[PDB]
């Protein structure tokens with residue numbers, strides 16, 4: 001993966017040597033070129049995963065996540081330039097540099113074959129996200145949000161390092177290829193119970209799990225727009241990828257250890273949809289929607305059936321695109337009205353019709369309108385959970401009803417009704433915001449034509 | 460006919476010829492423990508480098 005890392009570490013001198021007015025243009029251009037050359041990762045074989053060297057590899061699971069990361073970086077680059085126009089040039093270059101560094105760490109995270117390398121990069125993503133949130137935020141509680149995010153992650157994940165080093169010392173290697181062939185059954189004891197806990201609670205705090213989700217609606221509503229995109233669309237999926245990689249070594253203990261996390265995620269997705277029904281803010285609404293969808297992904301990964309895995313990976317890719325677009329729309333409205341309250345401005349369809357169309361498309365894909373990949377993932381998880389137990393259809397259907405309710409409540413309160421009277425600075429939508437919306441939509445709708453490329457390693 | 464020794468003569472160190480055998484073990488020492496084996500052989504390069512976590516060299 002040296003043909004994708006080296007262009008990233010060459011993007012860093014590109015933004016550090018550019019002119020005063022051409023940083024955004026050049027960096028957007030060359031990150032789009034990297035996103036184009038990312039398509040060579042689709043060389044997948046029906047039996048063997050694509051292996052590069054001793055340290056890097058790419059099966060069919062990490063390929064959509066890699067394409068999503070290196071496609072997402074230009075989008076944060078376009079959308080993070082209207083609130084940094086009045087910024088010092090060195091600070092703008094520092095912001096861009098942390099974005100490139102975070103993308104480099106993310107692509108060195110999914111691909112790394114050896115597990116402790118994946119852990120090193122998985123914790124290396126903590127520093128630039130915290131710096132972006134706590135430096136280029138807007139509110140007072142950004143410092144508290146950074147503290148909550150960092151400490152939830154690290155307090156959940158240092159036992160993961162201890163358990164991983166123990167696994168290295170017992171099995172003899174932490175390479176993932178060898179662990180597919182040197183795996184052993186893990187018997188019934190308290191020691192294996194705490195090993196399972198140490199291996200799983202890090203990823204499910206990052207995911208997040210219900211009850212441990214308190215870091216998410218703080219770190220999303222005080223971050224900038226690019227930080228919110230990279231939090232919602234990629235950084236939540238490190239937990240899912242880690243779960244998919246690490247449940248290999250946790251057999252046959254998961255069939256009676258994963259019950260309380262399943263109950264937590266089911267009642268948590270119900271409760272977080274209910275929260276979205278009574279939220280006074282747009283950003284917090286999208287944050288709790290993310291918590292609900294990630295609870296769905298947790299259930300799918302925990303029950304570990306092939307249909308659940310297909311639905312899980314489709315769900316992560318589709319949710320990443322949808323949540324990123326919703327955050328972009330909310331930030332455009334926040335730039336227009338300079339306030340975060342959903343009920344403040346109303347009836348924007350009469351003033352901004354094309355942005356209302358983009359709002360409609362995002363809200364429709366969020367409530368899993370077929371044949372989009374959102375309902376593809378949701379549908380596969382629904383069949384898998386019905387195979388697991390029948391009362392899951394009751395729980396899943398209640399979740400779907402409340403999901404449609406809050407998506408259309410958000411659409412009606414933001415776009416429909418009588419327009420507000422005393423707010424008179426609603427400028428027409430720029431070509432930049434519309435281009436960003438179209439760049440979020442068009443891959444998401446086009447992936448319904450050929451959805452076989454995001455259906456996991458066991459397609 | 461006895462002549463006294465001069466100065467420094469009675470402190471001289473002499474040689475004595477006697478018939479007793481030399482005691483082989485005056486200290487009654489037990490058998491000494493076996494020493495550790497000595498490191499030998501040419502120094503080959505390290506097998507697959509460092510062999511520390513993920514480092515290939």
Ligand SMILES: CCCCCCCCCCCCCCCCCC(=O)OC[C@H](COP(=O)([O-])OCC[N+](C)(C)C)OC(=O)CCCCCCCCCCCCCCCCC
Nearest residue numbers: 155156159160162163166191192194195197198201202205
């Ligand atoms: C997010 C917040 C909650 C986080 C929860 C995280 C999971 C909870 C449990 C984690 C335990 C610590 C890592 C254990 C890794 C075990 C690996 C292993 O080899 O296990 C088998 C080993 C086996 O024992 P052994 O290796 O000594 O024996 C050799 C093997 N036999 C038995 C055959 C001779 O288990 C242990 O050593 C015991 C593990 C439990 C340790 C209990 C102390 C820690 C308690 C939890 C603290 C959690 C953080 C608290 C603070 C949070 C922030 C404020």
